[PDB]
């Protein structure tokens, strides 16, 4: 029974703030759109690359204009072994994605701040719940 | 007069397509660096100067792309009281130069996120892009 983190890195990142600097004159009444998903790939013997996909879009309600759009593909290579089909499924769709989330959260907050928008720290995601939606 | 009103990022992109396997190749990096600037008046005496930076690194003994990073670092400046030439230098050299170190840190930051060895863009001589302008 094993679970080790070999490497954590980003495969793809995108941040866009189309309507700058004028959007800064509108009233900051944010509408956040948040999309998430994960995917796994065996990259070797007992080596799996787990990818956490985070998509975030913020628009200002009083006009619908887009403030910013941020997409992150956070990944990590893990050494996993000694688990029953179900146990492993949980580890690949919940356990590992969960370890990667705070990294992706930091990257999103880091880029958003570079656009000088008010802080955006994604709220915790219960992946054990996103695991249930998988068995179905 | 020359004052910095706000510094922000308009667009950012970092991609490392060949992970995690690329980490198995010999790190013999070949760096491609592209740069350019563009200005836009956004108000009375208010100009938005944008520094465009593109960086692509490939490993020589394979040609595979390690990572590609594109940044659009900008700033809004209050500029006034300059003759046509002095204003031109300010928009194509002075301002871009103030923005560079911020763009440098952004590239550096993203590269780190991909766990590649650190990349700290060497200083750029913006007076050169000023001359190119005049000509």
């Amino acid at each position: 029974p094993v679970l080790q983190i070999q490497r954590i890195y980003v495969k793809d990142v995108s941040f866009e703030a189309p309507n700058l600097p004028h959007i800064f004159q509108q009233e900051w009444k944010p509408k956040l759109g948040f999309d998430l998903s994960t995917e796994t790939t065996q990259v070797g013997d007992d080596l799996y690359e787990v990818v956490l996909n985070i998509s975030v879009e913020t628009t200002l309600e009083d006009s619908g204009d887009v403030a910013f759009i941020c997409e992150v593909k956070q990944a990590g290579v893990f050494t996993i072994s000694g688990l029953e089909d179900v146990q492993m499924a949980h580890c690949l769709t919940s356990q590992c994605p969960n370890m990667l989330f705070p990294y992706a959260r930091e990257l999103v907050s880091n880029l958003v701040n570079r656009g000088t928008f008010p802080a955006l720290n994604l709220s915790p995601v219960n992946f054990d719940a996103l695991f249930v939606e998988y068995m179905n | 007069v020359l004052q910095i009103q706000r510094i922000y990022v308009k667009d950012v992109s970092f991609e490392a397509p060949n992970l995690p396997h690329i980490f198995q190749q010999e790190w013999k990096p070949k760096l491609g660096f592209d740069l350019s600037t563009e200005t836009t008046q956004v108000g009375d005496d208010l100009y938005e100067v944008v520094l465009n930076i593109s960086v692509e690194t490939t490993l020589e003994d394979s040609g595979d792309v390690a990572f590609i990073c594109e940044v659009k670092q900008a700033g809004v400046f209050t500029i006034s009281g300059l003759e046509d030439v002095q204003m031109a230098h300010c928009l194509t050299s002075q301002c871009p130069n103030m923005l560079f170190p911020y763009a440098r840190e952004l590239v550096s930051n993203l590269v780190n996120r991909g766990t590649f060895p650190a990349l700290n863009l060497s200083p750029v001589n913006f007076d050169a892009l000023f001359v190119e302008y005049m000509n």
Binding site: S14 | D11, V12, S13, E15, P17, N18, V65, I68, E70
Partner: peptide
């Protein structure tokens, strides 16, 4: 032609996810 820019070919995909990919 920018990485985040819509790809020239109405794909809808960002140029880097279409005609600008470097996926070896």
């Amino acid at each position: 032609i920018g990485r985040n820019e819509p790809c020239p070919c109405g794909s809808g995909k960002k140029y880097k996810h279409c005609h600008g990919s470097r996926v070896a």
